[PDB]
Every structure is written in C-alpha cells, then in structure tokens.
Amino acid sequence: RGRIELIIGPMFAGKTTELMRRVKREIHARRSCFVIKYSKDTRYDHDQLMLRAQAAVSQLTEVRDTWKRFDVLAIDEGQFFSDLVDFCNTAADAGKVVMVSALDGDYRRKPFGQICELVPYCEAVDKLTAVCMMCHEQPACFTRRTVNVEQQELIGGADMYIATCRECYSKQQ
Amino acid sequence: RGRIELIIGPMFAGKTTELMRRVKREIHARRSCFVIKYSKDTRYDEHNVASAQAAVSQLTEVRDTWKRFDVLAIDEGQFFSDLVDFCNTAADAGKVVMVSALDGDYRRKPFGQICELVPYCEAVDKLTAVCMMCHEQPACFTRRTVNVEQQELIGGADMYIATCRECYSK
Amino acid sequence: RGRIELIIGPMFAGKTTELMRRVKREIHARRSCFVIKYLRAQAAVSQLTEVRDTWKRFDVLAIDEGQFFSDLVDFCNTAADAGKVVMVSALDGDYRRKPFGQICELVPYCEAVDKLTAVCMMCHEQPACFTRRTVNVEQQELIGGADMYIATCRECY
Amino acid sequence: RGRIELIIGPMFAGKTTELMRRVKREIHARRSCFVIKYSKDTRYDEHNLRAQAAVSQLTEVRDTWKRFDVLAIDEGQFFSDLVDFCNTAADAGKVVMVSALDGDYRRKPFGQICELVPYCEAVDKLTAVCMMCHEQPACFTRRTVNVEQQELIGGADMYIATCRECYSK
Ligand SMILES: Cc1cn([C@H]2C[C@H](O)[C@@H](COP(=O)(O)OP(=O)(O)OP(=O)(O)O)O2)c(=O)[nH]c1=O
Ligand SMILES: Cc1cn([C@H]2C[C@H](O)[C@@H](COP(=O)(O)OP(=O)(O)OP(=O)(O)O)O2)c(=O)[nH]c1=O
Ligand SMILES: Cc1cn([C@H]2C[C@H](O)[C@@H](COP(=O)(O)OP(=O)(O)OP(=O)(O)O)O2)c(=O)[nH]c1=O
Ligand SMILES: [Mg+2]
Ligand SMILES: [Mg+2]
Ligand SMILES: [Zn+2]
Ligand SMILES: [Zn+2]
Ligand SMILES: [Zn+2]
Ligand SMILES: [Zn+2]
C-alpha cells in the first residue's frame, strides 16, 4: 500500500538524482507519478507515454486535489514546504507512494523545515553523502555556507555552499 | 576520523542488536568501546586490557570517562536530554559515536533530541520490525497497548506493539 | 511473498548476528523460524537434503554458514518458490578471495544482498571487506576463528 | 584509499543512474573520472579531467586510466577482463565503480560479475518495479522476445523486470 520515503543528506549528494531514479522506476511499471518542486528559479534535469505531471509551487495546498489521481508523489526540496507532514501523511494514508528529497539540516546544522519532524512518519529514510569539497578525501554529510548571509532561506548552489566532512565543517578559513 | 551514527526505527526492530554488532566489530579490531545505557544504575571499567558499560540518567554523569575510549555506543538515546551536545563534543574529539534510539514515540511525535540529532549524523539507518498485528508487512511505527498518556513509559511487549501504517490506525 | 535474502562480507562483520536479528524480528510477529547451521527450530547438518521436508512447516528459513552447503541454490529456490522467507548468512569469498561455495552463484536468485564490513584488524582505521588467513594451510575448508583468520582492508590484505 | 564498488540488480532499476550519481559526486569535489561504457561493433574515446570511452575489452583503454581518480564502468557484465582490471586499478589506489546485471534473463551469472563480488568493498543491489503485476518490487529480468543468445543488447521492447511469482508466469 501507501508510504513515505525520505531522501536526505547535504548539498551535492545527488538526492534529487535519487528521487528521479525512483520516479523513472515507477514509470516503467506504468505507474503514474506527480513530481512537485519548489518555487526556486534554477535549471532542472519529457520521455514517456504514461501519466506524468510536474508542478512548481510555494505551498502544497496549491496542488488542491490533483494528487488524488496519481500513484506516486515525488516532492523535491521538501524542506521549503510548511505543510509537508500533514500533506505526505494524508496522501500516504490514501494509499499513495510519497517520496521526499530534502536537506535534513541547514548551513548551521539546525533542522531544516519540517524534515526532522517528518522522520517518525517515514517507512524509509536514506541519507546520502557528498564528497568533501574542502579536503577531497572523505565523505561529506554537512553543508557549509561560503557567503555571509544569516537568513536561513537562501536559494543557490556551488557559488554559495560547499559540502563538507566533520573536521572541515569547523575549519575557520 | 570522528563521527556520529544513528540507528532508529520502531520497537522490536533489533536496533540494540545492531548497535552491539557494530560494537563487537570494533572490539575485534582491538578498539576500545564504552557502552552507555539508560536508567537508574551502575558503572564499570574492568576488562581494561592493554595487550566499559555505564547505566545513567544524564550523560553528564559520565564526566570525562569517555575521553579514554575509541568508540561510544549509546543505547536508548532518546531518553538523554544532553544527547546532541554530548555526541558532538565527542565526535569532534575524534570519537566514533553510535546511537540506537526510537525516532518517534507511540503517537509518532519526535522522541527526545533524536530528530534534532539527525542533521549532525554522518549516517542514519532506520530499521524495520515486522507488523505484530497483520504479521504480513514490515513495521515502522510503535503502538501503545495500555492506556497511559505519559510519553516516558519504560516497558516492552506487554505495553507496546510494532505496526505497519494501515494497522497503526486500526 | 517468498524470497531469498543474502548476508555476506568477510569474517568478523557480524553476519551471523544480523541473521539472528532478522530471525528474532520474525518471531516477535509470531512467525515460525527454522535455523539451519553447518515457533523456533534449530538443525545442524552437513547437506540440506538432511532436513528432508521439515522446512515445509516453517515460515522463515535461516541458513548460517551457507557457503559450506553444496545444495544451497536449488534448496533456497525450491523453498522461496513455495513462499518461504529464506535468509542466508555466508562468506562470499574465501581467504584467497575466490568465490566460496555456491554463494556467488546464488546472487542472481536473491531479492536482496547485504554485504557487511568488519573493521581492519591490521591497521584498525579502515573498514574491512576481506579475510586473510594467518596459518599456513592451503585447503579451502578450514573451520576456525580469530586464531586462524583476520579481517582486512585492501591495502592490508 | 582504493576500492571496488558494485551496483547490481535487474533491468529498469536505475543502476546506470546510480553509477552516474556517484560520478557527479566525485566531480563536484574536483576528482577526475573516467566513464567506460560497452560497445561491440564500434570503439570510441573522448577526453578534455572527465573522460568517456566505449570499448569491447578493457585492455583497449591501455594505461589511460592511470591518470584518473575514479573509474566508472557501466554494463560491466560484458567485459571478460573485468576482475583483473578492477583489481589492478583498485590496488593502484583507484576508486573503481561498476554497474551491471548480476544475472541474465535465465538467472545464470552474467559475465564475471558474481566472480567479482568477493573483491568488492561494497555491493548494492537495486530493485525495479515489477512490470507484470505493478504491485511488488522486481529483482529479475525476463526476456520478451524469442532469442536464445545470452548477449542481446536492447531495452523495454525486448525485456521486462519482474518479481519472483511473475518471473514463472
Ligand atoms: C514506543 C515507546 C517506547 N517507550 C520506551 C519503552 C521501551 O522500553 C523503550 C524503547 O526501546 P527499544 O530499544 O526501541 O525497545 P526494543 O528492544 O523493543 O527495540 P530494539 O529491539 O530495536 O532495541 O522506550 C516510551 O517511553 N514511549 C514510547 O512511545
Ligand atoms: C575465511 C575462511 C573461513 N572459512 C570457515 C572458517 C569459519 O568457521 C567459517 C566462517 O564463519 P564466520 O561466522 O563468517 O566467521 P565469524 O563468525 O568471525 O564472522 P560473523 O560473525 O560476521 O559471521 O568459514 C573457510 O573454510 N575458509 C576461509 O577461507
Ligand atoms: C537481461 C539481459 C540484458 N542484456 C543486455 C540488454 C541491455 O542492453 C543490458 C542491460 O543493462 P542495464 O543498464 O541494466 O539496462 P537498463 O538501463 O534498463 O537498467 P538500469 O536503468 O538499471 O541501468 O544488457 C543481455 O544481453 N542479456 C540479458 O539477459
Ligand atoms: Mg532495545
Ligand atoms: Mg543501464
Ligand atoms: Zn573534509
Ligand atoms: Zn500490519
Ligand atoms: Zn587496514
Ligand atoms: Zn510481479
């Protein structure tokens, strides 16, 4: 039946990649998927003859009942949706395969959005690791911010963030 | 090479088992381990070879003992209010910290500081039990069979059951 | 819902431990298990034919040290096809890294394969995926433990 | 820090996808990768450090791999010199990663893959979804055309991923 799967880890780990792997897997079995991304203007990646949908939204309420038609819900950048838990649950309880790719922690390692709160509801949690972009010789589980902004929500990539190991995360300069 | 590893899931999944598997693994490599378990009890530092097991209510009660050890294994981590800071301070010192815990309580709310610890972990494995209601599906939640509201209620099979999703609401 | 699950890795990785974890898991759900070594039953046997039809009564078959059983594949398959949860803990490779028994040959039939890692008992600071033999015996089958084998990483091997 | 990592499972499981996820990981850390694919009727190379070859036997890469941090070999099952090659490289300190079918359409060991397992520091088996019953994971590959040959290159028009029950139906 229905469930919630969570894909977490730092930036540069391939979480989104893994989310889509699972999506393509379901499509080959002719199961209908609805991919939900967050309103964050940044370049992405049609190739099947199945039922496949793709929304970009600020709050999951904005999808209304659209999801009911679908077998599989894939939510990327889940950390930015404030109604994540209730939404995934309501859907999973309806018998939907809900999959969520997210940062578990922000640049200061504080719980990012409702992600840590979602964990108790998940039938599976996979944490991916990046490679450390400072020492290049250890896996990376944290994300360090290279610009001087305090705000938690700051959309961006390699020019503003680096994936790091433990030692490296505290290295000052 | 220091780090935090987290082992979670519902009751009856073998988390503690897995914690100890990893402990024995380290011992075979002559690496020293300090196993920290939870309620109202002892300390030991014998079998102290050149060639430990504590039970406590708060991790402060271990003082600096851990500094001598290669590997820290903390079972039932959910009950320790100073978990995050403790595992971090240790991991940063270069210690292999491993934690077995319930990620969620009987109402599926975050249990203790476990969910808060996740961002600090280099690894997170969630184990699954078998559903003890329908016996034909894996189990990821813990249901409470007695009528107590309190979150902290220590106990086993007579007070809790591991369940799948459908069963959890039945 | 029948299947084969394989638990492999070198010595000192806790394979047997992991096999039993899964067993206890099933018992708590009141599912009947039959543990085969080389509600709960436990046999010790040289060839799996020696169990006859006993397994038919059971929900879950756990086979430890599977590498030593020459009839492993056909047995696990026949059972899994009957709807049994068959679980196998084994060394995938011997001390010279050659395929041990019918284990590598079983992989294509498995719904799951987990390889566990030990800690390297030479350098103490890297995971271990191979088993080195410390005594000078050539024979592949040599039963024993820490006095005759060590788990190692690549460099150390 | 050298090693061999194996990614196996049936068709339609995303093995190749997973191989490339790991590759992009390494690249972000400015680590040089050399992706080696299979091809029978044609051989090919391209460099500028990320490289991509297509070849019939891994000997055809000569010493090119020595310059690289990370070797990714897709469809490893078709290379008869796989074990010795991955080992030689891993022993040199290379991160060797291999995506492959562990078994063929009749579930017999495909190429040298099962023989490579004892040499691997990691083995992940991916699962597809069953394309017959659509409601169970899939760990085997069934062939839908009538060819006996083991080597038959192709996709969804010639193969389906299945669960256990379905594989015999
Ligand atoms: C589910 C739950 C457990 N508890 C208590 C009761 C148990 O003694 C303890 C859970 O510890 P566990 O170690 O999870 O118990 P277990 O042996 O069943 O699990 P495993 O085999 O995986 O180790 O916490 C609560 O206080 N509140 C709760 O909601
Ligand atoms: C390495 C090796 C072992 N053996 C035998 C000796 C052992 O008794 C047996 C391996 O048993 P294991 O149970 O693998 O050894 P272990 O108990 O140390 O590891 P774990 O707890 O992780 O299961 O196989 C061989 O015959 N040839 C070999 O090359
Ligand atoms: C099953 C099977 C495949 N093949 C060939 C056909 C395919 O081209 C190739 C399978 O490799 P894959 O890369 O595994 O096919 P895929 O891309 O569908 O799967 P994934 O997404 O997991 O990478 O091997 C055979 O020659 N014989 C066989 O029995
Ligand atoms: Mg326990
Ligand atoms: Mg492919
Ligand atoms: Zn680093
Ligand atoms: Zn159930
Ligand atoms: Zn070593
Ligand atoms: Zn099927």
Numbering used by the authors:
A (entry chain F): 3 to 47, 54 to 181
B (entry chain E): 3 to 53, 61 to 179
C (entry chain H): 3 to 40, 59 to 177
D (entry chain G): 3 to 50, 59 to 179
Paper lines:
Thymidine kinase (TK) catalyses the transfer of the γ-phosphate of ATP to 2’-deoxythymidine (dThd) forming thymidine monophosphate (dTMP). L. major Type II TK (LmTK) has been previously shown to be important for infectivity of the parasite and therefore has potential as a drug target for anti-leishmanial therapy.
The end product of the thymidine salvage pathway, dTTP, exerts strong feedback inhibition, limiting the phosphorylation of lethal nucleoside analogues or DNA chain terminators both in mam006Dalian and in T. brucei TKs. The LmTK–dTTP crystal has a well-resolved dTTP in the thymidine-binding site, the magnesium being coordinated by the phosphates, in all eight protomers in the asymmetric unit. The residues around the dTTP have essentially the same conformation as in the dThd complex, with the exception of E85 that is turned away from the 5’-oxygen of the ribose ring, no longer forming a hydrogen bond. In most chains of the LmTK structures this loop is also disordered. LmTK forms closed tetramers in all three complexes, which explains the lack of density for the adenine in LmTK-dThd and its unexpected position in LmTK-AP5dT.
